[PDB]
Structures are given as structure tokens and as C-alpha cells.
């Protein structure tokens, strides 16, 4: 975000570090469809914006968590089939 000069909606705002600012991206020839809002330019930073200088590549994902907590009444055991879980039919 600092390198690209964008602002993700709840974080900090810096200076550009490249403050000096053809008919390739003209209006007639580009198909306007699904706007390229700033989260996409942060997430995939070599695809959505030209000239990424000083940009590093940010850890695609972690799989999906399904940790189940047990905080109610304590008298439930450690191993217990939670009401969140789907059944395993036959």
C-alpha cells in the first residue's frame, strides 16, 4: 500500500515515494466490467496495476480454519460432537 500509493479502507496513508506523475488504455477500447477497486490492486499487485515498483508478494492464503471452541459450562467433555457440525449419514 505504501509502495503503490493506495489506501485499504481502515489502514494508514503515506507519501507516494514516486511523486512525479499514447492510446493504450483509452476509453473506446477497454471493456468496462467489474471495477478494479483498490483491494484487488493490493492483493495481486503485479496484475492489476502497471509499473509496480518496490512491491513484494503477499502470501496467497491459509486453508480454512475449523477450530471449535468449548467455553460453555465446562461440564461438556473435551471430545464432543458440536452442534455446528454436519452429520455423517449412511
Amino acid at each position: 500500500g505504501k509502495a503503490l500509493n493506495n489506501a485499504i479502507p481502515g489502514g494508514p496513508k503515506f507519501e507516494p515515494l514516486y511523486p512525479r506523475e499514447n492510446e493504450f488504455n483509452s476509453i473506446d477500447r477497454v471493456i468496462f466490467r467489474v471495477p478494479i477497486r483498490s483491494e484487488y490492486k493490493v492483493a495481486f499487485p503485479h496484475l492489476y496495476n502497471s509499473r509496480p515498483r518496490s512491491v513484494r508478494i503477499p502470501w496467497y492464503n491459509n486453508p480454512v480454519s475449523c477450530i471449535i471452541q468449548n467455553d460453555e459450562e465446562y461440564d461438556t467433555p473435551a471430545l464432543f460432537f458440536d452442534p455446528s457440525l454436519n452429520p455423517i449419514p449412511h
Binding site: 467455553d71 460453555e72 459450562e73 465446562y74 461440564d75
Partner: peptide, 29 residues
């Protein structure tokens, strides 16, 4: 609601009682 207080207002991190194993306010002038 909160696990140890038993009141419905707040969250488990916000309960002012001590965590267990198992009110007048200044009017805004």
C-alpha cells in the same frame, strides 16, 4: 452473552467480574 457474568449486555472480553473456571454514570454535561 457473557460466559461468566450471566448478564446479556456485553462480550466475554468485557465482563468486569474475574474470569472463572466454569450502576450510575456521570450524565453528559
Amino acid at each position: 452473552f457473557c460466559r461468566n457474568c450471566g448478564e446479556a449486555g456485553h462480550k466475554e472480553k468485557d465482563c468486569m467480574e474475574k474470569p472463572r473456571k466454569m450502576v450510575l454514570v456521570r450524565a453528559t454535561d
